[PDB]
CSV table of N, CA and C and ligand atoms in Angstrom, one decimal:
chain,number,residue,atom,x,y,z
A,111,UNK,N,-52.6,29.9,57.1
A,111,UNK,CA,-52.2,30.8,55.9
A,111,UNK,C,-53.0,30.4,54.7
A,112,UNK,N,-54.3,30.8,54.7
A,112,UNK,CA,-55.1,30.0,53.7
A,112,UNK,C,-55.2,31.4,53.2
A,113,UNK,N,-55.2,31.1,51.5
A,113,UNK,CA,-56.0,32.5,50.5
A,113,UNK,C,-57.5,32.3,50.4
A,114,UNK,N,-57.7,34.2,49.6
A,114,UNK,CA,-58.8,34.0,49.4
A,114,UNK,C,-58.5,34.6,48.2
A,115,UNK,N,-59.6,34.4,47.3
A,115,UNK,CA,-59.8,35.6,45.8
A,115,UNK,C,-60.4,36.8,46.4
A,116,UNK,N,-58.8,37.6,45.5
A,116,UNK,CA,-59.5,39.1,45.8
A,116,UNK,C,-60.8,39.6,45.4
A,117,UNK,N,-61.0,41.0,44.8
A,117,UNK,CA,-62.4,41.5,44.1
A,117,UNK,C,-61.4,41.4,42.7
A,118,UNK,N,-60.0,42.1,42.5
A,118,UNK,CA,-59.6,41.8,41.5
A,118,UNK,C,-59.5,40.4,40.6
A,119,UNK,N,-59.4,39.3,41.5
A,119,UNK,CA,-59.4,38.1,40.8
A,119,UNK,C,-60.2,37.4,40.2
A,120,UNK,N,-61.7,37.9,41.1
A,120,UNK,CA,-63.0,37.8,40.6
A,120,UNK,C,-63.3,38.5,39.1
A,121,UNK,N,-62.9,39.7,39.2
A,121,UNK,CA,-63.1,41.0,37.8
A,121,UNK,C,-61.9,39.8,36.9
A,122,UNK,N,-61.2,39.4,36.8
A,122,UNK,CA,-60.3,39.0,36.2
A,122,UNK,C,-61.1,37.6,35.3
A,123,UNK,N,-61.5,36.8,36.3
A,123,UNK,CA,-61.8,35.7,35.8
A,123,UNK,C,-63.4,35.8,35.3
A,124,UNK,N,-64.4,36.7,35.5
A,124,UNK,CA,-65.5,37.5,35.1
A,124,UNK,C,-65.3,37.6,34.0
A,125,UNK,N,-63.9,38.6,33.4
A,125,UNK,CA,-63.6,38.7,31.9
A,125,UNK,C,-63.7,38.0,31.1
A,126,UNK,N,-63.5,36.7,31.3
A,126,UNK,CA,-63.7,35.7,30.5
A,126,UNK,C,-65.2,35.1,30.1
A,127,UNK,N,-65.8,35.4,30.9
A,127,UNK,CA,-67.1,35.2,31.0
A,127,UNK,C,-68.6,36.2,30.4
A,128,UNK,N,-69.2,35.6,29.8
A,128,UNK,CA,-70.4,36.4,29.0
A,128,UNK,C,-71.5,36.5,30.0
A,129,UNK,N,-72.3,37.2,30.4
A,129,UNK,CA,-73.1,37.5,31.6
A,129,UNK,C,-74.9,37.5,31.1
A,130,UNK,N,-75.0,36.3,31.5
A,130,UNK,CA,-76.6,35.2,30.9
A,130,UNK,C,-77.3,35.6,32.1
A,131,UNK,N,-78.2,37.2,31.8
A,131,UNK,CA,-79.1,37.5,33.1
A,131,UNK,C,-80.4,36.7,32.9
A,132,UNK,N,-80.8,36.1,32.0
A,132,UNK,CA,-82.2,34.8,32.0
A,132,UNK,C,-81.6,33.4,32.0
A,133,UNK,N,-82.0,32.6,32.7
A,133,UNK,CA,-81.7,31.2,32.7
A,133,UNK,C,-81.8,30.7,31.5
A,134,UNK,N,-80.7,30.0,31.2
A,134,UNK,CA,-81.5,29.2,29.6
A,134,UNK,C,-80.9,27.5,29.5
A,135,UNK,N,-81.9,26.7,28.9
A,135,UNK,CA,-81.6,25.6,30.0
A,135,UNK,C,-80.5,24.4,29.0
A,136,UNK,N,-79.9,23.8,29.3
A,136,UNK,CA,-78.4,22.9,28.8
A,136,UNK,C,-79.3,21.9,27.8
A,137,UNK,N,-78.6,21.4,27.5
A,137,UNK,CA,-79.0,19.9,26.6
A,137,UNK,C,-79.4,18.8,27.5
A,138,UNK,N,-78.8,18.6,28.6
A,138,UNK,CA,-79.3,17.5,29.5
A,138,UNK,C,-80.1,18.2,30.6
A,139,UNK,N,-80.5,19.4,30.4
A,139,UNK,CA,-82.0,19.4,30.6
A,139,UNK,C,-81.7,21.1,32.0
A,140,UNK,N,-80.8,21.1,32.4
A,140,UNK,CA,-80.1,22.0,33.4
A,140,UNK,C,-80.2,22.9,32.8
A,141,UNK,N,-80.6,24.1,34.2
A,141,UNK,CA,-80.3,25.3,33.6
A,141,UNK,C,-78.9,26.1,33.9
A,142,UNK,N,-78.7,27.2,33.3
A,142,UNK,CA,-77.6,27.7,33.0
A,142,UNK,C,-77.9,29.4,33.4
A,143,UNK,N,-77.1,30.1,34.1
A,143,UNK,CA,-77.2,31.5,34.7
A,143,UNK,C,-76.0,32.3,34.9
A,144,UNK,N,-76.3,33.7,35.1
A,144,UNK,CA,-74.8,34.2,35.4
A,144,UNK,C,-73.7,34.0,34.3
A,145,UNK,N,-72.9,33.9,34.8
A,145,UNK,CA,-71.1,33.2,34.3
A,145,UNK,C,-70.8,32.2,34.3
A,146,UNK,N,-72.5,31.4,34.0
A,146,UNK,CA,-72.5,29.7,33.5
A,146,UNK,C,-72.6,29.1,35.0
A,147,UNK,N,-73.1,29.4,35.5
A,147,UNK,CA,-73.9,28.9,36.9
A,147,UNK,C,-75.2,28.3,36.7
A,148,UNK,N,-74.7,26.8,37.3
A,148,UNK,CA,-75.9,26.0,37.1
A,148,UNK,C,-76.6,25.2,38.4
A,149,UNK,N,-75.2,25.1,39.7
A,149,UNK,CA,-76.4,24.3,40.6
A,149,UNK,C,-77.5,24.9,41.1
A,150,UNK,N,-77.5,26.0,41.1
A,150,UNK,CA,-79.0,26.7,41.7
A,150,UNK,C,-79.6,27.3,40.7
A,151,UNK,N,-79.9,27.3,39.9
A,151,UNK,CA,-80.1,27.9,38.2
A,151,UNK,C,-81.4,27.2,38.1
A,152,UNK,N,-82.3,27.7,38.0
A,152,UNK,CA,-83.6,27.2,37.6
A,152,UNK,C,-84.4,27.7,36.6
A,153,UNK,N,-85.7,26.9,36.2
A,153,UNK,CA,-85.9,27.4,35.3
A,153,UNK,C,-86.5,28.9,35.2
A,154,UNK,N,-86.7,29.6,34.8
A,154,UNK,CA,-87.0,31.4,34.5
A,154,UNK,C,-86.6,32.5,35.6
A,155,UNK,N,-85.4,31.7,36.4
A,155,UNK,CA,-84.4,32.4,36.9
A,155,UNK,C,-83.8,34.2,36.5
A,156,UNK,N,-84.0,35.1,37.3
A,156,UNK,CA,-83.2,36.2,36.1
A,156,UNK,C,-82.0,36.5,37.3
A,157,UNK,N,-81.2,37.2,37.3
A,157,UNK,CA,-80.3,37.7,37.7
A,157,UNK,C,-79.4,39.2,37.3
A,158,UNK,N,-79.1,40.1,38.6
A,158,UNK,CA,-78.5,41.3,37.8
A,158,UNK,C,-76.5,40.8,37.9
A,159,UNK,N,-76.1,41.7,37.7
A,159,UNK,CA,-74.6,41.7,37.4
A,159,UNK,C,-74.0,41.4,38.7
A,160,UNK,N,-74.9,42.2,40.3
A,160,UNK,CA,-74.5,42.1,41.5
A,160,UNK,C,-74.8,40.4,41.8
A,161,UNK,N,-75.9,40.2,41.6
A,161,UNK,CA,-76.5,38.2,41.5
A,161,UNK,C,-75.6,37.0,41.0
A,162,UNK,N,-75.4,37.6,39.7
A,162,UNK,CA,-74.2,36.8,39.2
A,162,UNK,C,-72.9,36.5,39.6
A,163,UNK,N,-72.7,38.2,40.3
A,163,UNK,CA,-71.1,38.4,40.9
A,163,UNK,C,-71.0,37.0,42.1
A,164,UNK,N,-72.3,37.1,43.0
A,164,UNK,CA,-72.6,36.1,43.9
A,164,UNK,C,-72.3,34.5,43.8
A,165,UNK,N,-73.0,34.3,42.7
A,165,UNK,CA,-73.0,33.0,41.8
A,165,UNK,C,-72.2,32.2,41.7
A,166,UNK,N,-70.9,33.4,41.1
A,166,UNK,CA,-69.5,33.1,40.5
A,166,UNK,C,-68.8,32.5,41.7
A,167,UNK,N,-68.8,33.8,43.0
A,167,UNK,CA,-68.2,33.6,43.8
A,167,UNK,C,-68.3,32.3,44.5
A,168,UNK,N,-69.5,31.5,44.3
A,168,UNK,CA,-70.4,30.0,44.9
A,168,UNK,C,-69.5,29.2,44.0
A,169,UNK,N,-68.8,29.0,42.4
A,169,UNK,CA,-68.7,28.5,41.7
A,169,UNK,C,-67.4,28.7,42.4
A,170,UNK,N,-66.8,29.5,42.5
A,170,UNK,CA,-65.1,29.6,42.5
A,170,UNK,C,-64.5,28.8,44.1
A,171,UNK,N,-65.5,28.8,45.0
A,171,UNK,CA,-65.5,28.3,46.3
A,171,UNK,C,-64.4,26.9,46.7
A,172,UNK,N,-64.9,25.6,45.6
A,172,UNK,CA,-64.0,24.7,45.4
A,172,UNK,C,-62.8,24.8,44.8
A,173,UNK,N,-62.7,25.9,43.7
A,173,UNK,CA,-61.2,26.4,43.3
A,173,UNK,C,-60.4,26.8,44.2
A,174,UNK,N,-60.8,27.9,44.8
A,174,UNK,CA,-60.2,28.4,46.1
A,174,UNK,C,-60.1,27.1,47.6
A,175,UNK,N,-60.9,26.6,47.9
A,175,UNK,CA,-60.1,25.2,48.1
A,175,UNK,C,-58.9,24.6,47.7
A,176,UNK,N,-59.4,24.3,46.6
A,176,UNK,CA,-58.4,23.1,45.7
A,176,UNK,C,-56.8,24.0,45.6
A,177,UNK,N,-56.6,24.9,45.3
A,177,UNK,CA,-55.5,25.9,44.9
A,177,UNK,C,-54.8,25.8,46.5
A,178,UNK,N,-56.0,26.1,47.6
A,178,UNK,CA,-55.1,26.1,48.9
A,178,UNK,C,-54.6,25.0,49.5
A,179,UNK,N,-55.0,24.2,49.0
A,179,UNK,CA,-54.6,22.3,49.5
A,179,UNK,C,-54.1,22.1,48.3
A,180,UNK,N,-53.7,22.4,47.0
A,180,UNK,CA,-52.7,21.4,46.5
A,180,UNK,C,-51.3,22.3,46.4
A,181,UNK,N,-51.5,23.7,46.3
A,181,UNK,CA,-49.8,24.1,46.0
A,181,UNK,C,-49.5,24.2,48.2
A,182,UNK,N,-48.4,24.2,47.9
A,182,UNK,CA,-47.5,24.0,49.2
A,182,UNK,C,-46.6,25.3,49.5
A,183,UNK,N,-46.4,26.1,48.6
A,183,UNK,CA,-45.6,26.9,48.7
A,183,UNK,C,-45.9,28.3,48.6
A,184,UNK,N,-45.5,29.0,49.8
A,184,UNK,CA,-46.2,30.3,50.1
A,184,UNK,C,-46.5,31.2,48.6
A,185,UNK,N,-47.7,31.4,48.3
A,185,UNK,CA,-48.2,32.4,47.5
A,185,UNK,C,-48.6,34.1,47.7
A,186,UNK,N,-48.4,34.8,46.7
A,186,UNK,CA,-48.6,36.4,47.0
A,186,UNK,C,-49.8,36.4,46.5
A,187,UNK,N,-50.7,37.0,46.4
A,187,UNK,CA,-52.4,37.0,46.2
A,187,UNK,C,-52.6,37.1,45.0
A,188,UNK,N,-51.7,37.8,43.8
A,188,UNK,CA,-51.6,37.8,42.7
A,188,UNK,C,-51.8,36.7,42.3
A,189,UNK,N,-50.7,35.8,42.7
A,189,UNK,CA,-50.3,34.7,42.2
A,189,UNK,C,-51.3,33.1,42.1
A,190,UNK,N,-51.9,33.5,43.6
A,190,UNK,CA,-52.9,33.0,43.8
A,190,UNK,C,-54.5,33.0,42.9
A,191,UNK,N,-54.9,34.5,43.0
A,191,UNK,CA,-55.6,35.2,41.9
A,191,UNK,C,-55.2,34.1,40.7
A,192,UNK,N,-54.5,34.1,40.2
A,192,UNK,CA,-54.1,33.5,38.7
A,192,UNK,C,-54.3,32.2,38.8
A,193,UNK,N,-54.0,31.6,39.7
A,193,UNK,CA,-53.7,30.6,40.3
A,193,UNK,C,-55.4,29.9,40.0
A,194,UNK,N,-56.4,30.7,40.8
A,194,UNK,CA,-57.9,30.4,40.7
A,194,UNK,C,-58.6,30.4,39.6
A,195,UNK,N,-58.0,31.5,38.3
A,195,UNK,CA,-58.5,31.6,37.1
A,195,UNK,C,-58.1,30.2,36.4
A,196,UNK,N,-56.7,29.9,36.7
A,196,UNK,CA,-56.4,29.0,35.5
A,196,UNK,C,-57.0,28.0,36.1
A,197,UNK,N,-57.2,26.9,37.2
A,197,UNK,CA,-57.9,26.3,38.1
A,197,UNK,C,-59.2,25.9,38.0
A,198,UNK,N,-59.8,26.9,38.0
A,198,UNK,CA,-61.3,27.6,37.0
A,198,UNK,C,-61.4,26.8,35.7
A,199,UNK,N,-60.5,27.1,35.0
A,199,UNK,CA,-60.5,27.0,33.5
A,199,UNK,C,-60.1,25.8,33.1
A,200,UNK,N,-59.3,24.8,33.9
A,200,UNK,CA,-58.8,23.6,33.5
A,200,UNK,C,-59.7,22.8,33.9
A,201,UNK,N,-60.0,23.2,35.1
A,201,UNK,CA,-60.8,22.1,36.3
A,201,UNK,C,-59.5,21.8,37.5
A,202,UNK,N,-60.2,21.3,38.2
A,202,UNK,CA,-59.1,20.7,39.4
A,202,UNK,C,-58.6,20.0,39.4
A,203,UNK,N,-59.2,18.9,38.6
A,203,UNK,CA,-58.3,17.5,38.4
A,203,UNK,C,-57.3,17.4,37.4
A,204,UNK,N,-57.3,18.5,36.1
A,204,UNK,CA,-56.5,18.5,35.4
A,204,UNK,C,-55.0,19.7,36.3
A,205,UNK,N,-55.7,20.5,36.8
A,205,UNK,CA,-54.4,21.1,37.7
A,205,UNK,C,-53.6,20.5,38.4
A,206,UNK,N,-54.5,19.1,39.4
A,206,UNK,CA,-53.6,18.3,40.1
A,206,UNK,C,-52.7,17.9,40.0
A,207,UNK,N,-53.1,17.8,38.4
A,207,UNK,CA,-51.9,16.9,37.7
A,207,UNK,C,-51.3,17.4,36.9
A,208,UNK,N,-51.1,19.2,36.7
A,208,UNK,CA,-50.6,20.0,36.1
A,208,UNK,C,-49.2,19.9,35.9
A,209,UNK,N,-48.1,20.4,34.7
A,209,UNK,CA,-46.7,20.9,34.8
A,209,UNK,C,-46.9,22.0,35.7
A,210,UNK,N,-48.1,23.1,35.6
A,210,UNK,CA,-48.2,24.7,36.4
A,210,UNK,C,-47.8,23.8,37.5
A,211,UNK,N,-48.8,23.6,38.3
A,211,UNK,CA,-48.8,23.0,39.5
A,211,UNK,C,-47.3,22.7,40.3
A,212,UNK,N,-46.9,21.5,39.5
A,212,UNK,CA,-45.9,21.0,39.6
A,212,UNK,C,-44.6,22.1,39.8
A,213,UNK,N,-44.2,23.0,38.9
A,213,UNK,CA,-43.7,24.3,39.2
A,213,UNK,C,-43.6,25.2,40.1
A,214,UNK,N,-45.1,25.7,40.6
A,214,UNK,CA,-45.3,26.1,41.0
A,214,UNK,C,-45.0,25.5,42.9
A,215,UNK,N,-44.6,24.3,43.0
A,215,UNK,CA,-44.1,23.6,44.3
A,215,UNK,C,-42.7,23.4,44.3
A,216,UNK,N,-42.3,24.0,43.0
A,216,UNK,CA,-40.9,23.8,43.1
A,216,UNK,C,-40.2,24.9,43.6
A,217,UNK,N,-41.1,26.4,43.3
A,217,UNK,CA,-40.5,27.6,43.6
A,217,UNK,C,-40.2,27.9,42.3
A,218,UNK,N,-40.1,27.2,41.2
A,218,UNK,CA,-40.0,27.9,40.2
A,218,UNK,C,-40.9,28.5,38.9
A,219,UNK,N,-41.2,29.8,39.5
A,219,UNK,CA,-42.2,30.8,39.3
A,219,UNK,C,-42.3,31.1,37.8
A,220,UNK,N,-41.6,31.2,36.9
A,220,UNK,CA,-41.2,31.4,35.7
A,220,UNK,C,-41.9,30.6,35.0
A,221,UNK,N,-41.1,28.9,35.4
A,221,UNK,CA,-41.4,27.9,34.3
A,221,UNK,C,-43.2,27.9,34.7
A,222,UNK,N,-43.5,27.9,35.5
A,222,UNK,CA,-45.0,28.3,36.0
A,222,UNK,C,-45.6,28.7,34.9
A,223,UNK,N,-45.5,29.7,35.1
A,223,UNK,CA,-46.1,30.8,34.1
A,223,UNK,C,-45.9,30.5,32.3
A,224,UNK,N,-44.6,29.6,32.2
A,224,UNK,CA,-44.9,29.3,31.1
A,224,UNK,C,-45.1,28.1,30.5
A,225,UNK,N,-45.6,27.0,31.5
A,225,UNK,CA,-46.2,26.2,31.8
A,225,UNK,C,-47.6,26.4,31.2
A,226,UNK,N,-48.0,27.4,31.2
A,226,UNK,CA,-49.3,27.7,31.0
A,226,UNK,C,-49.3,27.9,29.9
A,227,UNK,N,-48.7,28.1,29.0
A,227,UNK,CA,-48.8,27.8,27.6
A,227,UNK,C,-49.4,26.6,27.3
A,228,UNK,N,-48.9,25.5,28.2
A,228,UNK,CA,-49.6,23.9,27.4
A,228,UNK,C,-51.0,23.8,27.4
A,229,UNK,N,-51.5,24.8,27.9
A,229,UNK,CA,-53.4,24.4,28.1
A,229,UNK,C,-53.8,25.9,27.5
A,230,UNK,N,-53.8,25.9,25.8
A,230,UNK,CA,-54.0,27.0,25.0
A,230,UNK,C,-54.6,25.7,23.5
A,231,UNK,N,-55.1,24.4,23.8
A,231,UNK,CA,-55.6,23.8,22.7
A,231,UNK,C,-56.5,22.8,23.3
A,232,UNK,N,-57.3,22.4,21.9
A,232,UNK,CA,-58.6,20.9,22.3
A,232,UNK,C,-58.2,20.2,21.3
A,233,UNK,N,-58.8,19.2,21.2
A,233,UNK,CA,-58.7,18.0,20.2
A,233,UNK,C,-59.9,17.8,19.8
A,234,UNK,N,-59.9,18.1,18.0
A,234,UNK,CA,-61.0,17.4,17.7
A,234,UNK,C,-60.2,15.7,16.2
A,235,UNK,N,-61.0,14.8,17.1
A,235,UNK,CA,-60.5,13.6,16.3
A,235,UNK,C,-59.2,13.5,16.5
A,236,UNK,N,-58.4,13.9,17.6
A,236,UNK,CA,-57.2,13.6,17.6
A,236,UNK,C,-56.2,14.4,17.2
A,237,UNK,N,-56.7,15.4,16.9
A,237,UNK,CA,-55.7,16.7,16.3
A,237,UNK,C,-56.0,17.7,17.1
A,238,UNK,N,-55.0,18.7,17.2
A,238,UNK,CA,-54.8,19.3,18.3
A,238,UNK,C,-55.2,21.0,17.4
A,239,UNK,N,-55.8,21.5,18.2
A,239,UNK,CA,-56.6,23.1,17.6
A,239,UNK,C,-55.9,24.3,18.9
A,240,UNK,N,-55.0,25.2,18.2
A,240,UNK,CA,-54.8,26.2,19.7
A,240,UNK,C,-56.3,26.9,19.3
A,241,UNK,N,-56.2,27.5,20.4
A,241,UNK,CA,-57.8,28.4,20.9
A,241,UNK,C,-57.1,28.9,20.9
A,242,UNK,N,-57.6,30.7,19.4
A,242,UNK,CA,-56.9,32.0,20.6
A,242,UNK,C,-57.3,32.4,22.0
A,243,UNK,N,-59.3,32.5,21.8
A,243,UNK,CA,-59.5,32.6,23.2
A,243,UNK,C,-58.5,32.1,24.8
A,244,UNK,N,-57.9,31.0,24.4
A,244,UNK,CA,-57.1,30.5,25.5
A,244,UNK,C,-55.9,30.9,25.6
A,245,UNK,N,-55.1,31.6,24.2
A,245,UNK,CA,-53.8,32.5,23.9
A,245,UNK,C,-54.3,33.9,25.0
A,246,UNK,N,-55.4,34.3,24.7
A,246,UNK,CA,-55.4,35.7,25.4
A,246,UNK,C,-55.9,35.5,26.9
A,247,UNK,N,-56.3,34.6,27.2
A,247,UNK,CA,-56.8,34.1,29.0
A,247,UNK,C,-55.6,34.2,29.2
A,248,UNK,N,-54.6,33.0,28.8
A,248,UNK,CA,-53.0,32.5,29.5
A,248,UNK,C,-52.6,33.7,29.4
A,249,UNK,N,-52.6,34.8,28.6
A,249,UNK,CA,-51.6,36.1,28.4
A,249,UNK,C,-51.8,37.3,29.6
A,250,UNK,N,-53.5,37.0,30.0
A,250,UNK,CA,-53.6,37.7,31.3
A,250,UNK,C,-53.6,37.0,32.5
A,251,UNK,N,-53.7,35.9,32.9
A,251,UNK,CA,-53.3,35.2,33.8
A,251,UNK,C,-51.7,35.1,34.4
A,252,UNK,N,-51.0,35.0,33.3
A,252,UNK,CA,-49.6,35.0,33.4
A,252,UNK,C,-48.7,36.1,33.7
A,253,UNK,N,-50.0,37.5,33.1
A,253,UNK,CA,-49.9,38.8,33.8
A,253,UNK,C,-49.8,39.2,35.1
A,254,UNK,N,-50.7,38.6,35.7
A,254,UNK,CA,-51.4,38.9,36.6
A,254,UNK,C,-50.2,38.1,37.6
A,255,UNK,N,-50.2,36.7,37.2
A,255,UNK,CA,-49.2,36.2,38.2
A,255,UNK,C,-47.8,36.1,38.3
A,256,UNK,N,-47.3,36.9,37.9
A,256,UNK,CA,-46.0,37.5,37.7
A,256,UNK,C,-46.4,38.9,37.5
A,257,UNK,N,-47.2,39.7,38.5
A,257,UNK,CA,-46.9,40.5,39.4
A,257,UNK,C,-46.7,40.8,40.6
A,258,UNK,N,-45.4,41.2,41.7
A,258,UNK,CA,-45.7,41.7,42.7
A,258,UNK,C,-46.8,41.5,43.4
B,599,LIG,CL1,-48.4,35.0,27.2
């Protein structure tokens, strides 16, 4: 009983994303493509929106892994879907070690979801900054996974 990302989950976590059809290349020297795709990203790379879609999908690959080996507890595709965006967005190692996570093996779907409130800020110098950007991700993620 392994998931996959739907096409919806893909379009979901896309949204957050700005769509870089020329390669342009990082500070430590990498280039950067698509929806921030960089292991195959070379230099004068172009890509269309269908190329990108590809890319993402190469990127999301270890999410979709990680999400199916660390929660334990049967998921509805939705949930999963959300499941890959936030996954995505934290990284894996910070999910491992998530409250979501944690929650989310307990069966309790709720605190889940608002669990996800704690990863809506960064630190600079030790002070804590909410991101709206991360207010309106968590607000569709948490949509998305608490539905049906
Ligand atoms: Cl919300």
């Amino acid at each position: 009983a392994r998931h996959k990302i739907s096409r919806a989950g893909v379009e979901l976590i896309k949204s957050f994303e700005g769509l870089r059809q020329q390669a342009s290349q990082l500070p430590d020297g990498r280039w950067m493509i698509g929806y921030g795709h960089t292991f195959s990203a070379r230099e004068g790379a172009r890509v269309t929106a269908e190329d990108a879609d590809a890319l993402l999908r190469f990127d999301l690959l270890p999410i979709v892994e990680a999400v199916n080996n660390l929660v334990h507890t049967p998921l509805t595709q939705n949930q999963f879907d959300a499941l890959v965006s936030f996954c995505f967005n934290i990284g894996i190692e910070a999910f491992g070690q998530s409250d979501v996570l944690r929650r989310v093996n307990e069966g309790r779907v709720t605190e889940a979801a608002q669990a996800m409130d704690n990863w809506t800020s960064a630190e600079f110098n030790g002070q804590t900054y909410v991101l709206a950007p991360l207010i309106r991700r968590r607000a569709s993620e948490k949509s998305l996974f608490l539905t049906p």
